[PDB]
Design a protein around this ligand. Structure first.
Ligand code: HEM
Length: 291
């Protein structure tokens, strides 16, 4: 399969910056969701779930086609809870009907990271909506109850190496797990809508205890009220992953730089960009614009 990026007709930087500002302004306005965590964390989870179906072997899945609008994908049990992020985006799409679904779902993720004071993420336009029979089947997204060997093997399918996987996993400092969505309960840290390396710091410094939650699943719990999934705790069990966790716990800037590259790569996997396509855009935050 070859998916070639095609810029929405006649659009440029200024057009996509208006759609960024529309999302950022509504993120500020709708601050009450999920006991005042707001919508930022479920929007970067949605951008990762629409990209995380990709398979490097035959180029199916990925962000390009925006197939999450179709029932088979929207109803995947792995996507429980992301309907909240899709309904947040629906008024923005009605206001800007020219943007493709893939571009809006990935730009929602870039916007949230930047507005939660994370790194700038360069983003490229041009995903094109494809037909319902191109919707990937359920079951391509990862399980939470596994170990380090599983995480490593799983992410090889998305062409991600150990540094990229540990950097990507730093996004679990955002938001929280919800018992009715995944069968796990609790936050990973104290700062759940500010982008930071606190996940790595908690993993190395908290006293964790393996307990069973109300959905009868095991998870690691700390005396401070934080939790870690089996797949998160993995990162300190494996020797290769633990050296990178220690590097990011001691250098916030290197974590920001490595996340930015790996999150842009995630969102662009499977897409061919023509050599005459525009450069990646870097959008300004509302704060840098004084809005
Ligand atoms: C082996 C890899 C991963 C697994 C098993 C996993 C698992 C989970 C689970 C079980 C939840 C809870 C969902 C809920 O109950 O609402 C969650 C939430 C979340 N995940 Fe992951 N995840 C993985 C990788 C990632 C990556 C690569 C990113 C982002 C780059 C990410 C970002 C998030 C965010 C921000 C949330 C918070 C959602 C919210 O607060 O509503 N995850 N993850």
């Amino acid at each position: 399969l070859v998916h070639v990026a095609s810029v929405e007709k006649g659009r440029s930087y200024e057009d996509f910056q208006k759609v960024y500002n529309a999302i950022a302004l509504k993120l500020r306005e709708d601050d009450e969701y999920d006991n005042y965590i707001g919508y930022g964390p479920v929007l970067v989870r949605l951008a990762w779930h629409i990209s995380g179906t990709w398979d490097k072997h035959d180029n199916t899945g990925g962000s390009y086609g925006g197939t999450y609008r179709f029932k088979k994908e929207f109803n995947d049990p792995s996507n429980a809870g992301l309907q909240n992020g899709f309904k947040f985006l629906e008024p923005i799409h009605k206001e800007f009907p020219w943007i493709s679904s893939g571009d809006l779902f990935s730009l929602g993720g870039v916007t949230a990271v930047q507005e939660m004071q994370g790194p700038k993420i360069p983003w490229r336009c041009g995903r094109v909506d494809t037909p319902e029979d191109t919707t990937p089947d359920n079951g391509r997204l990862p399980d939470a109850d596994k170990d380090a060997g599983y995480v490593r093997t799983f992410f090889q399918r998305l062409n991600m190496n150990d540094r990229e996987v540990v950097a990507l996993m730093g996004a679990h400092a955002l938001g929280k797990t919800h018992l009715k969505n995944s069968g796990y309960e609790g936050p990973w840290g104290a700062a759940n809508n500010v982008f930071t390396n606190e996940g790595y710091l908690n993993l190395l410094n908290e006293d964790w205890k393996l307990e069973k939650n109300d959905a009868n699943n095991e998870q690691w719990d700390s005396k401070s009220g934080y939790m870690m999934l089996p797949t998160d705790y993995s990162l300190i069990q494996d020797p290769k992953y633990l050296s990178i966790v220690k590097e990011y716990a001691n250098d916030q800037d290197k974590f920001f730089k490595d996340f930015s590259k790996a999150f842009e790569k995630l969102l662009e996997n499977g897409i061919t960009f023509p050599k005459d396509a525009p450069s990646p855009f870097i959008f300004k935050t509302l704060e840098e614009q004084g809005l």
